mmCIF file of C-alpha atoms in Angstrom:
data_model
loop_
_atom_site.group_PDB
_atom_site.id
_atom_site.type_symbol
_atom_site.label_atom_id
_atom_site.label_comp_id
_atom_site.label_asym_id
_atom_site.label_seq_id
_atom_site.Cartn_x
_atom_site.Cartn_y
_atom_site.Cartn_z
ATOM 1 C CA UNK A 1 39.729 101.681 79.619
ATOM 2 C CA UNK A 2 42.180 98.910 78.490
ATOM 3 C CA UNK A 3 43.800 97.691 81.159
ATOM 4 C CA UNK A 4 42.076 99.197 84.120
ATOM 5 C CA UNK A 5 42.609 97.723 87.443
ATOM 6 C CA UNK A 6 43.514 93.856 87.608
ATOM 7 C CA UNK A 7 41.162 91.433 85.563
ATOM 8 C CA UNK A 8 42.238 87.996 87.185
ATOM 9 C CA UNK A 9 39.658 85.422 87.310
ATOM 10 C CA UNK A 10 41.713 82.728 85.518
ATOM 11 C CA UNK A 11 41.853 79.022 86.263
ATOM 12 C CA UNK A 12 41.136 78.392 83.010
ATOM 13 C CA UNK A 13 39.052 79.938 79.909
ATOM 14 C CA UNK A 14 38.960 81.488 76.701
ATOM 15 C CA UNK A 15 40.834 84.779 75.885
ATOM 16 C CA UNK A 16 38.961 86.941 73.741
ATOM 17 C CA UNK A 17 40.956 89.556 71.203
ATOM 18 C CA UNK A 18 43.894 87.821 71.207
ATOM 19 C CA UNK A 19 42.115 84.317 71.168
ATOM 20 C CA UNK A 20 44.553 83.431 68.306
ATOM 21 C CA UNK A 21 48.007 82.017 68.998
ATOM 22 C CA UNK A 22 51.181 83.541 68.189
ATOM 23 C CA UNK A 23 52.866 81.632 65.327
ATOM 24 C CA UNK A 24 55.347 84.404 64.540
ATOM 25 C CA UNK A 25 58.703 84.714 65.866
ATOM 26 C CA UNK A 26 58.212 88.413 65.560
ATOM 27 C CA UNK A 27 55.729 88.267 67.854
ATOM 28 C CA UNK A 28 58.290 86.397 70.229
ATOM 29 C CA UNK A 29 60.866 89.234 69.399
ATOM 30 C CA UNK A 30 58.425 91.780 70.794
ATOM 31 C CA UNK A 31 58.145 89.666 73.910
ATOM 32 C CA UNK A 32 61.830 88.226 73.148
ATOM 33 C CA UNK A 33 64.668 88.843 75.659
ATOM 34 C CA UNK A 34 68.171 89.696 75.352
ATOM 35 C CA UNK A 35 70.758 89.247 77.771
ATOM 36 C CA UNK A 36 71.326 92.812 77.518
ATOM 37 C CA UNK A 37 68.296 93.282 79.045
ATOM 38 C CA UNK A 38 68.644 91.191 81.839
ATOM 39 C CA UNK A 39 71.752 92.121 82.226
ATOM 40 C CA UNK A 40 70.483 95.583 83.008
ATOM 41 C CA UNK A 41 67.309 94.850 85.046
ATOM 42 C CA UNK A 42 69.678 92.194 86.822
ATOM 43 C CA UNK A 43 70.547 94.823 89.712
ATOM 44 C CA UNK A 44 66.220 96.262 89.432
ATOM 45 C CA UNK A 45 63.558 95.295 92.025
ATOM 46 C CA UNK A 46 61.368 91.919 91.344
ATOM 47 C CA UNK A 47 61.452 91.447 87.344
ATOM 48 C CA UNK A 48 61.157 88.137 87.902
ATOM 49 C CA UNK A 49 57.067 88.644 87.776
ATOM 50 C CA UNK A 50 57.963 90.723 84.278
ATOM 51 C CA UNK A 51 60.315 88.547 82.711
ATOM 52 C CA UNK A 52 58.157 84.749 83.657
ATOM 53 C CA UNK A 53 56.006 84.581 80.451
ATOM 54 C CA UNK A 54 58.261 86.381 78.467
ATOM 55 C CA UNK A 55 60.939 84.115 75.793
ATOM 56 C CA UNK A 56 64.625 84.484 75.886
ATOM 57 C CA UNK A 57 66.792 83.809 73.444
ATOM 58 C CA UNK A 58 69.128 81.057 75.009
ATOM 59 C CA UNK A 59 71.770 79.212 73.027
ATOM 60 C CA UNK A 60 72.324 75.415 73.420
ATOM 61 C CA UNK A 61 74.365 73.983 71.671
ATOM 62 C CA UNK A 62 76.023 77.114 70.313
ATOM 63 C CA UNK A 63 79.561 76.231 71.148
ATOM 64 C CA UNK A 64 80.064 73.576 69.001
ATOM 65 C CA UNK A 65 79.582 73.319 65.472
ATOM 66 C CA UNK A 66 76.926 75.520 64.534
ATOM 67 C CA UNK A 67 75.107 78.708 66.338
ATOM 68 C CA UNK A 68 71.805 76.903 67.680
ATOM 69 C CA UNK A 69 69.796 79.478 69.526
ATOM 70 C CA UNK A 70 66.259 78.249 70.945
ATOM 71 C CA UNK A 71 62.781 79.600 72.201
ATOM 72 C CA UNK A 72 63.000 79.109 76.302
ATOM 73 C CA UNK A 73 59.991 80.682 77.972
ATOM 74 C CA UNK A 74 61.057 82.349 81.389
ATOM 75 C CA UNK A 75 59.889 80.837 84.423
ATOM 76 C CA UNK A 76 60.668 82.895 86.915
ATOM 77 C CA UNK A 77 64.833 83.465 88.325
ATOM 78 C CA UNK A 78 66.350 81.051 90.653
ATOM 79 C CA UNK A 79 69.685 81.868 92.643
ATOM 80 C CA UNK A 80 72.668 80.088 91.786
ATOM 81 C CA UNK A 81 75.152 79.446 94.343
ATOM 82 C CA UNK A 82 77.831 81.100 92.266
ATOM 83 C CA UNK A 83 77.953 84.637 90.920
ATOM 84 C CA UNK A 84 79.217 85.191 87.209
ATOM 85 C CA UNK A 85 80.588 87.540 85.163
ATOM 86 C CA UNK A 86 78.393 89.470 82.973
ATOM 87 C CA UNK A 87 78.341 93.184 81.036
ATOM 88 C CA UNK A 88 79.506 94.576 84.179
ATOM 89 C CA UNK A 89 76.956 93.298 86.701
ATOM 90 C CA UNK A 90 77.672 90.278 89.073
ATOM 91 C CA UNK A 91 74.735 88.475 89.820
ATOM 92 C CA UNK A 92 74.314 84.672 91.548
ATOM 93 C CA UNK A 93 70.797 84.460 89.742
ATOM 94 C CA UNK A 94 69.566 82.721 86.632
ATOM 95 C CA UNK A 95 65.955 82.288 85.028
ATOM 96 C CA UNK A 96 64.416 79.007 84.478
ATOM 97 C CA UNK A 97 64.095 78.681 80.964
ATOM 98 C CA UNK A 98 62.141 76.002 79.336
ATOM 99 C CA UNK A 99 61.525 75.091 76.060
ATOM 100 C CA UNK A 100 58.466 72.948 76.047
ATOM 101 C CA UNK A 101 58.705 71.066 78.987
ATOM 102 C CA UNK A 102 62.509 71.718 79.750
ATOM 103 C CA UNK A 103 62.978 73.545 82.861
ATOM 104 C CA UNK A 104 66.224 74.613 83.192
ATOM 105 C CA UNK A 105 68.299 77.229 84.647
ATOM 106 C CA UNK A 106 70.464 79.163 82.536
ATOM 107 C CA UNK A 107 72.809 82.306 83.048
ATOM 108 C CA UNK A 108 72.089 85.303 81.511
ATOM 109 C CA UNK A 109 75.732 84.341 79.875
ATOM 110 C CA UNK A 110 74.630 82.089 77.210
ATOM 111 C CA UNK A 111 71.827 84.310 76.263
ATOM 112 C CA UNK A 112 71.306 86.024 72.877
ATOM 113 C CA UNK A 113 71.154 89.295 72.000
ATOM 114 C CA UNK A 114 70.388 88.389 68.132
ATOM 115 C CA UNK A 115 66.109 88.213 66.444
ATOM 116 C CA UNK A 116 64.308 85.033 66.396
ATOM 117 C CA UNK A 117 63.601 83.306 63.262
ATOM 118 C CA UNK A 118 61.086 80.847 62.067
ATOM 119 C CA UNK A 119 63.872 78.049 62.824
ATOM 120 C CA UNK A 120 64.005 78.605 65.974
ATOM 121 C CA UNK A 121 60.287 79.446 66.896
ATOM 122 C CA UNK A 122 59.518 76.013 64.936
ATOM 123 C CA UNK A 123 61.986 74.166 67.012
ATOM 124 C CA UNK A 124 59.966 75.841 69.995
ATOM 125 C CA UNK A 125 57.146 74.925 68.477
ATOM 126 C CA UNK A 126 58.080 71.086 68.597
ATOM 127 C CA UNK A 127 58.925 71.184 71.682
ATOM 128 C CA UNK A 128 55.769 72.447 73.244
ATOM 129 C CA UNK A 129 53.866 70.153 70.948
ATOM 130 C CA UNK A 130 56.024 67.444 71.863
ATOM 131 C CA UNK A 131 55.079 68.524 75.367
ATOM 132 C CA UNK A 132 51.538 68.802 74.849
ATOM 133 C CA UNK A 133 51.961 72.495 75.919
ATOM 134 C CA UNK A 134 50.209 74.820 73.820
ATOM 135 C CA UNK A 135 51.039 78.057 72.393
ATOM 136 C CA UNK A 136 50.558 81.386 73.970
ATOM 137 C CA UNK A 137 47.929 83.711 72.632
ATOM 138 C CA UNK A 138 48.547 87.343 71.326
ATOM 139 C CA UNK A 139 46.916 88.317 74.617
ATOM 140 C CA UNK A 140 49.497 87.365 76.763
ATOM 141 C CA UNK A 141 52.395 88.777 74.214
ATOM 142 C CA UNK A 142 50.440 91.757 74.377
ATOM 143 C CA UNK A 143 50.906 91.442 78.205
ATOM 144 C CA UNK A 144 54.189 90.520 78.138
ATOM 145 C CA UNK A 145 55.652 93.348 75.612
ATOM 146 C CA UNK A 146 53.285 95.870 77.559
ATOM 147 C CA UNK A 147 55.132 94.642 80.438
ATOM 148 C CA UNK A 148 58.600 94.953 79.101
ATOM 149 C CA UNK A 149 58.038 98.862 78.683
ATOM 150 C CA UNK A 150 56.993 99.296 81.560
ATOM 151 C CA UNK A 151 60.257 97.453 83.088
ATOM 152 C CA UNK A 152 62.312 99.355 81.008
ATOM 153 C CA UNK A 153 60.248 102.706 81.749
#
């Protein structure tokens, strides 16, 4: 039909349909990530698989000054060595966030729960640009938010 058994033969190609890259922060908020949702697939089975691809909504740099919330694409969840307090979970993990190329472990804690906007999905933008990383297609954030209800459901 659709999606109808596993179609992997990717090392490298051209997606068709969604050839087209997603230059929409709405299209990020389908595929976006609150901590509130990690939060409660933080005690769930392996949504690490679910979640890599997928952007978060991290904050850097929201502490001082003014609220500045970025783009980080997860890659994957790492374990810290210390567990934290969240919505009532308590979890010693943490997702590998990057923006661009900046891997970098965050806690769920300084996660978002707030929309995208073109600020922020431009400041993404530079920084897989800068990176020489390109942007995903509406193929894979068709994958991704397909993904996401079936995580949730």
């Amino acid at each position: 039909m659709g999606s109808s058994h596993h179609h992997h033969h990717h090392s490298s190609g051209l997606v068709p349909r969604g050839s087209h890259m997603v230059s929409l922060p709405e299209e990020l908020n389908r595929v976006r990530l609150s901590r509130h949702k990690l939060e409660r697939w933080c005690h769930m089975p392996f949504f690490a698989k679910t979640v890599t691809g997928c952007f978060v909504r991290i904050g850097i740099g929201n502490h001082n000054s003014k609220p500045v919330y970025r783009v980080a694409e997860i890659t994957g969840v790492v374990e810290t060595a210390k567990v934290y307090q969240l919505g009532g979970t308590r979890t010693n993990k943490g997702l590998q966030l990057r923006h661009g190329n900046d891997q970098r472990v965050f806690r769920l804690e300084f996660v978002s729960n707030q929309e995208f906007t073109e600020s922020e999905f431009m400041k993404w933008k530079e920084a897989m640009f800068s990176a020489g990383m390109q942007l995903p297609t509406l193929d894979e954030i068709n994958k991704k938010e397909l993904s996401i209800k079936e995580a949730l459901n």
